[PDB]
Design a protein around this ligand. Sequence first.
Ligand SMILES: CSc1nc2c(cc1NC(=O)N1CCC[C@H](C(N)=O)C1)CCCC2
Ligand SMILES: [Zn+2]
Length: 139
Amino acid sequence: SGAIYVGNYRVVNRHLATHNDWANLVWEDSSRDLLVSSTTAQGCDTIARCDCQTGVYYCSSRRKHYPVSFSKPSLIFVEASEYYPARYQSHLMLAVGHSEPGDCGGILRCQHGVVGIVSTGGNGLVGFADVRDLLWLDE
Ligand SMILES: CSc1nc2c(cc1NC(=O)N1CCC[C@H](C(N)=O)C1)CCCC2
Ligand SMILES: [Zn+2]
């Protein structure tokens, strides 16, 4: 679990969005596994606007942060799950690192701010949904 709080927006994995997220919907994209909802309180986070390919992510299944080198945002095949049919997920970045079900929502950060959130996993792999192109989160 996990979310980004920036301005009057809350960014979460679309597959983990609550009834309240959907009732205050701003934007969602099933192909990116992202959903943004509106908040009444001002958030705590800054979004990175950069091309970093190294950073640190929080891994809830280890209660620890790990450094990673990650690929550029791209269209990657993701196998069927309880939440989605088999499909290509866009704006996804992969890295070698630990992840397991329960870890989605963990934040990936570089020196400039928040880069994205955990969205997929593999055997010794972790995938992150990029948010750096969503310039409207800043306004
Ligand atoms: C960290 S999540 C995770 N981790 C692992 C496995 C599986 C998962 N789960 C997923 O990848 N998804 C399920 C939820 C929707 C995700 C999506 N973006 O389409 C896909 C298997 C075994 C190794 C670890
Ligand atoms: Zn950066």
